[PDB]
Amino acid sequence: MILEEKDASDWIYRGEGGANLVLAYAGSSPLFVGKVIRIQKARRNDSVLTSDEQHLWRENNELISSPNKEVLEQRYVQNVIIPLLGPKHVDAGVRVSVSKEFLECVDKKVTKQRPLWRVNAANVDTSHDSALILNDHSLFSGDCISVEIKPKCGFLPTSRFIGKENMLKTSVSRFKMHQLLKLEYIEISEESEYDPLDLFSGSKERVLEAIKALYSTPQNNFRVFLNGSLILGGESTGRTSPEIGYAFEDALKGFIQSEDGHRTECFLQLVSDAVYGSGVLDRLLEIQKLDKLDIEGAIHCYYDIINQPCPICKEELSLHALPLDESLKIVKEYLIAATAKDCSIMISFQSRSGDYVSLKPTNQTFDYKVHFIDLSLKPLKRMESYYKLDKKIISFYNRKQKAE
Ligand SMILES: O=P(O)(O)O[C@@H]1[C@@H](OP(=O)(O)O)[C@H](OP(=O)(O)O)[C@H](O)[C@H](OP(=O)(O)O)[C@H]1OP(=O)(O)O
Numbered sequence: 001m002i003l004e005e006k007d008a009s010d011w012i013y014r015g016e017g018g019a020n021l022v023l024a025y026a027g028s029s030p031l032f033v034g035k036v037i038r039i040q041k042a043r044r045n046d047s048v049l050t051s052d053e054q055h056l057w058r059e060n061n062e063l064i065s066s067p068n069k070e071v072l073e074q075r076y077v078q079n080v081i082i083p084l085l086g087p088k089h090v091d092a093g094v095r096v097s098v099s100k101e102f103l104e105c106v107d108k109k110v111t112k113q114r115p116l117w118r119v120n121a122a123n124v125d126t127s128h129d130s131a132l133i134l135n136d137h138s139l140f141s142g143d144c145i146s147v148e149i150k151p152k153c154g155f156l157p158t159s160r161f162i163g164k165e166n167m168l169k170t171s172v173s174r175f176k177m178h179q180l181l182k183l184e185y186i187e188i189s190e191e192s193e194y195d196p197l198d199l200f201s202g203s204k205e206r207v208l209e210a211i212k213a214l215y216s217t218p219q220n221n222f223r224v225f226l227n228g229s230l231i232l233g234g235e236s237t238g239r240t241s242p243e244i245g246y247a248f249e250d251a252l253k254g255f256i257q258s259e260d261g262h263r264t265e266c267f268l269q270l271v272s273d274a275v276y277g278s279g280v281l282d283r284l285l286e287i288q289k290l291d292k293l294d295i296e297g298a299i300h301c302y303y304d305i306i307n308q309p310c311p312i313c314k315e316e317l318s319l320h321a322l323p324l325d326e327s328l329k330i331v332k333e334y335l336i337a338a339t340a341k342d343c344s345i346m347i348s349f350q351s352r353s354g355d356y357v358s359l360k361p362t363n364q365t366f367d368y369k370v371h372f373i374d375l376s377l378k379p380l381k382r383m384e385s386y387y388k389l390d391k392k393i394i395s396f397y398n399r400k401q402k403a404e
């Protein structure tokens, strides 16, 4: 009922996103076996919702009346996301109380396993009294190999609201553009080989092409687990070396019944057939496409919502003419889309339901489950920051192409 200082040694580091630090259970307790703990970070860059936020989520009252951030996230997933993606692939998590000492203790424990830049940006928020418990989907429900993909955005904007100068956002994906800016900022060592347009394309061959690329340059988009311990990918991690490639190949023996050296290609095909067969990407894409207008459109609607004069227009007379009702719907939908754009997918495998994949070369049958994880509510205030960042992306790409 309250996790204490002594309980902190039963949880081991699993990884983290921007918002959360995730630990896995390594103790004996039947309440916690096969679970992970999600803990919110105190951003040194940054009560539950702002005034303008409360007006935006007005429609869903259980949300606006959340005692704390944990409950907020749980309810966001439960009442907004689940109705849209379905309960089969989404899990909302359960509240648990935690002591300041537990948090303080956990934070100290995992410091030397965290990337230094992550430490530099944020620590655990020791002021929270709560945390979230979720099923660990790197366990199935024998051996279990599991694969985490963070697909990002898989479509091109179409909007009337993209500026004349910015038209390259129409041909070239956001992830591809951002890659270039990230490189410039020493955030990544080399450009990723991944193109989400392939992953979401609905073409089987392009799906396998995306998986091969994800294997190649995982960065923060690909991870593989054997029974919970990480065996590929990182934070963002560098290109897959022969060293990496061999360690992974070895870790796969037994699970993939193929000749030494041919296990990897089998595995990648296995992942591809699962993603594609499950059609789980199509439904995520429909939620992504709730960004109907692109940030270059939506931004105008935001300034109406907060009741400020629009700086983006200077000294369209079309979005500012919409009813306030409609303006909220649009911005609301923009923020949901942002959730779907930044979540990840976990596909769990175990040897053999109508849910399975066949390995043509080996004759094995693998069962699989797919779950959407890392689904965060996005603060409304970020609408201003989305526009700035988008602008920085596109201006830098145009500048790279200006150097023909
Ligand atoms: O903005 P993006 O698309 O770069 O995504 C951010 C992510 O950067 P990425 O490009 O995936 O490396 C970013 O991931 P990293 O911090 O790079 O691991 C976060 O996931 C961030 O969301 P939040 O702050 O955790 O709510 C993400 O921010 P939101 O855009 O989802 O607010």
Ligand SMILES: [Zn+2]
Residues within 6 Å of the ligand: 300, 310, 311, 312, 313, 316, 320
């Ligand atoms: Zn405007």
